[PDB]
Design a protein around this motif. Structure first.
Motif, mmCIF file in Angstrom:
data_model
loop_
_atom_site.group_PDB
_atom_site.id
_atom_site.type_symbol
_atom_site.label_atom_id
_atom_site.label_comp_id
_atom_site.label_asym_id
_atom_site.label_seq_id
_atom_site.Cartn_x
_atom_site.Cartn_y
_atom_site.Cartn_z
ATOM 1 N N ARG C 32 -5.485 -4.026 1.400
ATOM 2 C CA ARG C 32 -4.941 -4.028 2.772
ATOM 3 C C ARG C 32 -3.483 -3.582 2.918
ATOM 4 N NH1 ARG C 32 -3.790 -8.385 2.656
ATOM 5 N NH2 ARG C 32 -1.534 -8.254 3.067
ATOM 6 N N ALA C 33 -2.656 -3.966 1.947
ATOM 7 C CA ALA C 33 -1.238 -3.614 1.906
ATOM 8 C C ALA C 33 -1.016 -2.108 1.807
ATOM 9 C CB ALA C 33 -0.570 -4.310 0.746
ATOM 10 N N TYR C 34 -1.913 -1.420 1.093
ATOM 11 C CA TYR C 34 -1.862 0.039 0.989
ATOM 12 C C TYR C 34 -2.289 0.695 2.291
ATOM 13 C CZ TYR C 34 -1.875 4.687 -1.106
ATOM 14 O OH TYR C 34 -1.581 5.998 -1.415
ATOM 15 N N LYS C 35 -3.290 0.126 2.948
ATOM 16 C CA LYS C 35 -3.676 0.657 4.237
ATOM 17 C C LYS C 35 -2.523 0.467 5.195
ATOM 18 C CE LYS C 35 -6.935 2.525 2.820
ATOM 19 N NZ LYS C 35 -8.404 2.329 2.959
ATOM 20 N N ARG C 36 -1.736 -0.587 4.981
ATOM 21 C CA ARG C 36 -0.560 -0.843 5.807
ATOM 22 C C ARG C 36 0.475 0.253 5.634
ATOM 23 N NH1 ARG C 36 3.326 -6.011 4.766
ATOM 24 N NH2 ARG C 36 3.555 -6.500 6.999
ATOM 25 N N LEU C 37 0.836 0.506 4.378
ATOM 26 C CA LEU C 37 1.853 1.494 4.044
ATOM 27 C C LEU C 37 1.505 2.837 4.663
ATOM 28 C CD1 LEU C 37 3.426 1.834 0.440
ATOM 29 C CD2 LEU C 37 3.845 3.353 2.418
ATOM 30 N N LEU C 38 0.249 3.232 4.492
ATOM 31 C CA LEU C 38 -0.261 4.480 5.035
ATOM 32 C C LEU C 38 -0.030 4.552 6.534
ATOM 33 C CD1 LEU C 38 -2.491 6.801 3.673
ATOM 34 C CD2 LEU C 38 -1.083 5.270 2.387
ATOM 35 N N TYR C 39 -0.272 3.446 7.225
ATOM 36 C CA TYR C 39 -0.190 3.433 8.677
ATOM 37 C C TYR C 39 1.240 3.441 9.201
ATOM 38 C CZ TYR C 39 -0.552 1.800 13.526
ATOM 39 O OH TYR C 39 -0.418 1.644 14.898
ATOM 40 N N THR C 40 2.146 2.745 8.528
ATOM 41 C CA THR C 40 3.530 2.803 8.973
ATOM 42 C C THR C 40 4.092 4.190 8.624
ATOM 43 O OG1 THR C 40 4.306 1.647 6.949
ATOM 44 C CG2 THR C 40 3.943 0.319 8.905
ATOM 45 N N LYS D 28 -5.584 3.887 12.359
ATOM 46 C CA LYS D 28 -4.868 3.166 13.390
ATOM 47 C C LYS D 28 -5.491 1.793 13.569
ATOM 48 C CE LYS D 28 -3.434 7.310 16.033
ATOM 49 N NZ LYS D 28 -3.402 8.068 17.333
ATOM 50 N N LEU D 29 -6.818 1.728 13.586
ATOM 51 C CA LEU D 29 -7.475 0.440 13.727
ATOM 52 C C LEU D 29 -7.164 -0.447 12.534
ATOM 53 C CD1 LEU D 29 -10.946 1.173 15.265
ATOM 54 C CD2 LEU D 29 -8.867 0.428 16.368
ATOM 55 N N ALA D 30 -7.290 0.123 11.336
ATOM 56 C CA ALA D 30 -6.994 -0.582 10.093
ATOM 57 C C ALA D 30 -5.626 -1.271 10.133
ATOM 58 C CB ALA D 30 -7.049 0.365 8.934
ATOM 59 N N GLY D 31 -4.627 -0.594 10.694
ATOM 60 C CA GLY D 31 -3.269 -1.107 10.669
ATOM 61 C C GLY D 31 -2.961 -1.907 11.906
#
Ligand SMILES: [Mg+2]
Ligand SMILES: [Mg+2]
Ligand SMILES: [Mg+2]
Ligand SMILES: [Mg+2]
Ligand SMILES: [Mg+2]
Ligand SMILES: [Mg+2]
Ligand SMILES: [Mg+2]
Ligand SMILES: [Mg+2]
Ligand SMILES: [Mg+2]
Ligand SMILES: [Mg+2]
Ligand SMILES: [Mg+2]
Ligand SMILES: [Mg+2]
Ligand SMILES: [Mg+2]
Ligand SMILES: [Mg+2]
Ligand SMILES: [Mg+2]
Ligand SMILES: [Mg+2]
Ligand SMILES: [Mg+2]
Ligand SMILES: [Mg+2]
Ligand SMILES: [Mg+2]
Ligand SMILES: [Mg+2]
Ligand SMILES: [Mg+2]
Ligand SMILES: [Mg+2]
Ligand SMILES: [Mg+2]
Ligand SMILES: [Mg+2]
Ligand SMILES: [Mg+2]
Ligand SMILES: [Mg+2]
Ligand SMILES: [Mg+2]
Ligand SMILES: [Mg+2]
Ligand SMILES: [Mg+2]
Ligand SMILES: [Mg+2]
Ligand SMILES: [Mg+2]
Ligand SMILES: [Mg+2]
Ligand SMILES: [Mg+2]
Ligand SMILES: [Mg+2]
Ligand SMILES: [Mg+2]
Ligand SMILES: [Mg+2]
Ligand SMILES: [Mg+2]
Ligand SMILES: [Mg+2]
Ligand SMILES: [Mg+2]
Ligand SMILES: [Mg+2]
Ligand SMILES: [Mg+2]
Ligand SMILES: [Mg+2]
Lengths: 144, 67, 60, 185
Positions: C32-40, D28-31
């Motif tokens: 999840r933390a990697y999906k976070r980084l990607l999104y920011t 976008k949904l994921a984050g």
RNA sequence: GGAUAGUGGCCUACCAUGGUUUCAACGGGUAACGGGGAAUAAGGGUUCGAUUCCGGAGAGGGAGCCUGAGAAACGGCUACCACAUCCAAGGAAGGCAGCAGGCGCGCAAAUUACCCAAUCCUAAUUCAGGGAGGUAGUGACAAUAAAUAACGAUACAGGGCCCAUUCGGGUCUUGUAAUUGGAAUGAGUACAAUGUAAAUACCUUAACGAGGAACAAUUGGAGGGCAAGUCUGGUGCCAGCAGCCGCGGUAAUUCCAGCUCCAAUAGCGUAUAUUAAAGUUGUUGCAGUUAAAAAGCUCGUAGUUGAACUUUGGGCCCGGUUGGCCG
RNA sequence: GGACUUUUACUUUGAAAAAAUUAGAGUGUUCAAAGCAGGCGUAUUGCUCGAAUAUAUUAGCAUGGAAUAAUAGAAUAGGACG
RNA sequence: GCCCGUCGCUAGUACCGAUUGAAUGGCUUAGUGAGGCCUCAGGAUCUGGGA
């Protein structure tokens, strides 16, 4: 109005006709004649284990100039003699004659790959281990 | 925690209607231990090769000890 | 065609490319933390918009 | 020779593997709901897909056909139950609409954040898996718990853990150990 | 008539010449046990079903038969064939397509463990027996849930925004950070209790158990299809890559690596098969002047198909199920 | 109870119908794949909802329909009623 | 420019082919025929015609 019968009782002719014509399907025919089990070096199975007879140096087709390193393999359940590519840089250095190898198809539905003429299989493993691991370094070739 | 409970009208009525592994857990019946299950089976089978008593076969095999 | 061309050079290039060890770098977060980084990285802060958008640029 | 155990898979992967419009839309949904997988979105789209298929079918039957009335009404109140279907729009041509996001905004991971209690979906995840927050006195550690409306008022920290009385915690208490074993006797 | 439990060419006598077939008999093939079912999702279809339930068949191959209510029984006998074990050479003995385990075969598949506690079966029977069956081991077959981190402070930098005659930072936070700060948790370990036939695990839970040396995510790709570099170094039609189109003969966007980036992620590649894409098997729904395809021509049987017309119109009742306006 | 009835196709409704699978209702296995449970109290001598429904198509059975499409009818009258 | 065939090299596949070639499996003539069953006998022994 052109073609086929339309009538309500002409079911039979309609099925028969299809039967007759299904034969022009390249895949259907192969299935029903059991071409696989009959021709084709493997049984019809996905992979085949064989023994290395000689190492070849197949020259590639045009417009490519190269020497594709390969092997002659005699499939164990078979006696069928087959030639197979040894993928990646070096790897032929891993095989040696009379060695045991695991052959797979080339993903082309029979048929040879690219510029390699008449080769329809690739290796995958040797002496029980796998080219991939050997080429990297994760595994070592067994004693004898 | 959720379980299940029983309570008998007497100590004589548990001791007769209770599963025997349960009375063991409690301490109101000893775990009568026996040989293995395949030790037992083998004994049954060894016993199958004998017809009658056995001691009759003790004496007769004892004569072989002369021949 | 020909079948018995040299085999002397098997693994020529791999054997003569100079080893350079992998570098030791920051541990990337997994899950999840990697999906976070990607999104920011891809949507929140934004980097550039040189006309459009770039993901793996260097010398531009 | 025993009854087979029945299973089902619970997700579906998109046909086109590399469509950047869809890929942006998914990330976008994921984050935005603190997910970890494309699968956690793939899952919901599958849940939807059938709900829609269901609804489509009923719609083709006659207005007030017995099955339509029975299973349609049932599908709606199930949907209303968890808070995906709004009260007004309650007659299935809207479930026929619906949307992935409606389903997402009802996860426990999000409801834990939606009213304070977390501030950032990711804190909200971490809290859930780490055995704090509960529904009754029943601890829940699955981020996908899908808060059902009538339990919404009951999402609070657990009687166990810090945050809800009970005990500080073994990493804090370890510090309360180095505190009076250095500065004391 | 005989035989059978009993119908019947089942078999035997006598007598007759019938029975099936282009509406495909008869024969061949099947890497054929049938079914409930499985996969694939517009629909129509296509492919699969050794295998948890039902039916059938078999127990190395054949045949024969004893017992018995029931077997043409194989963890029964008898013979022959194949195989095969012991021997003191005279003889005797065996049948894992039960459970486990070994060989062989191959691409291809696990423990020679515990128990009758459950589920049920059998016996003279509450009790005995049950490799039925349950338990655990092996086990990334498939399927489900979902950890690998979360929050503040500071240090410049931002963009917001009020002002801008012109220093600017100041408080709403967007965050990139090479010193910082306390928090949280189960992976694991482990009193105990629960679990259980006894165990083990799970569910509970004392004591332990996270700061980058982890408790450190992978597998593939980054020219097009096709999401991601015209970075650096190497090689120089070699080595290799490339499903397909294509790259490589000295500044390689495809190779070998480093860096960086992409996609799916406790999983991801490859091979083979099938299904969707395929209206490229077309009933729905193809195509046939020139792209593959109208028999040289006409007759014609099977087969398919086959114009119109025969109680229609008018009249009266009976009782329903929804919907409007009233309730 | 007696005496006689031209043949069909199609369609309708129903019966007869294994479970598991499938579609699907109910129920917060912590979620979920599942499972078929469970739920209320006087939780000290008990109260209670369930364990649906659908599909099940060819053929055979059973009932309604009389359009569409076939069959048969009286012409050497060996016709029809009584 | 395109381009056809014989001729020549390497490698691969299938075909024809003396060997009345070989192999496995299923049926089967004729000859020989085990065994149990049924049946005409038999009669060690052992009873009251029977076993
Ligand atoms: Mg042809
Ligand atoms: Mg080409
Ligand atoms: Mg050769
Ligand atoms: Mg073989
Ligand atoms: Mg015993
Ligand atoms: Mg005895
Ligand atoms: Mg007769
Ligand atoms: Mg005769
Ligand atoms: Mg004749
Ligand atoms: Mg035919
Ligand atoms: Mg078979
Ligand atoms: Mg089957
Ligand atoms: Mg089949
Ligand atoms: Mg088989
Ligand atoms: Mg049998
Ligand atoms: Mg065998
Ligand atoms: Mg035989
Ligand atoms: Mg037998
Ligand atoms: Mg048996
Ligand atoms: Mg002797
Ligand atoms: Mg066995
Ligand atoms: Mg056996
Ligand atoms: Mg396996
Ligand atoms: Mg007794
Ligand atoms: Mg017993
Ligand atoms: Mg067992
Ligand atoms: Mg790890
Ligand atoms: Mg660490
Ligand atoms: Mg990598
Ligand atoms: Mg691209
Ligand atoms: Mg260079
Ligand atoms: Mg370069
Ligand atoms: Mg590269
Ligand atoms: Mg995939
Ligand atoms: Mg049609
Ligand atoms: Mg076409
Ligand atoms: Mg033409
Ligand atoms: Mg013509
Ligand atoms: Mg003709
Ligand atoms: Mg007509
Ligand atoms: Mg019906
Ligand atoms: Mg049912």
């Amino acid at each position: 109005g052109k073609g086929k019968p339309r009538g309500l009782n002409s079911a039979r002719k309609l099925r028969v006709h299809r039967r007759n014509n299904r034969w022009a399907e390249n895949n259907y025919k192969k299935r029903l004649l059991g071409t696989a089990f009959k021709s084709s070096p493997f049984g019809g199975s996905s992979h085949a284990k064989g023994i290395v007879l000689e190492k070849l140096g197949i020259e590639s087709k045009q417009p490519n100039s190269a020497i594709r390193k390969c092997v002659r393999v005699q499939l164990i359940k078979n006696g069928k003699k087959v030639t197979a590519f040894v993928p990646n840089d070096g790897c032929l250095n891993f095989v040696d004659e009379n060695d045991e190898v695991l052959l797979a198809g080339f993903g082309r539905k029979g048929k040879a790959k690219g510029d390699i003429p008449g080769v329809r299989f690739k290796v995958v493993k040797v002496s029980g281990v796998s080219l991939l691991a050997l080429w990297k370094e994760k595994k070592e070739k067994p004693r004898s | 925690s959720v379980g299940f409970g029983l309570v008998y009208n007497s100590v004589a009525e548990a001791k007769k209607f209770e599963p025997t592994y349960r009375l063991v857990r409690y301490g109101l019946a000893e775990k009568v231990e026996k040989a293995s299950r395949q030790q037992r089976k083998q004994k049954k089978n060894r016993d199958k090769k004998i017809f009658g008593t056995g001691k009759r076969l003790a004496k007769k095999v004892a004569r072989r000890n002369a021949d | 065609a020909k079948v018995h061309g040299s085999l002397a050079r098997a693994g020529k290039v791999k054997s003569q490319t100079p080893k350079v060890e992998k570098t030791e770098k920051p541990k990337k977060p997994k899950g999840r933390a990697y999906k976070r980084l990607l999104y920011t990285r891809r949507f929140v802060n934004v980097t550039l918009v040189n006309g459009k958008r770039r993901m793996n640029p260097g010398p531009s | 020779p025993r009854a087979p155990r029945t299973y089902s898979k619970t997700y579906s992967t998109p046909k086109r593997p590399y469509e950047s419009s869809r890929l942006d839309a998914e990330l976008k949904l994921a984050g935005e709901f603190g997910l970890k997988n494309k699968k956690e979105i793939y899952r919901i789209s599958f849940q939807l897909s059938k709900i829609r298929r269901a609804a489509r079918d009923l719609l083709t039957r006659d207005e007030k056909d017995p099955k339509r009335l029975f299973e349609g009404n049932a599908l709606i109140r199930r949907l209303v139950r968890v808070g995906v279907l709004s009260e007004d729009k309650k007659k299935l041509d809207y479930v026929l609409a619906l949307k992935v996001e409606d389903f997402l905004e009802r996860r426990l991971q999000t409801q834990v954040y939606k009213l304070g209690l977390a501030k950032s979906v990711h804190h909200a995840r971490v809290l859930i898996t780490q055995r704090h927050i509960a529904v009754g006195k029943q601890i829940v550690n699955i981020p996908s718990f899908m808060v059902r409306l009538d339990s919404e008022k009951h999402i609070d920290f657990a009687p166990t853990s810090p945050f809800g009385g009970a005990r500080p915690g073994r990493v804090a208490r370890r510090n309360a150990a180095r505190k009076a074993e250095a500065s004391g006797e």
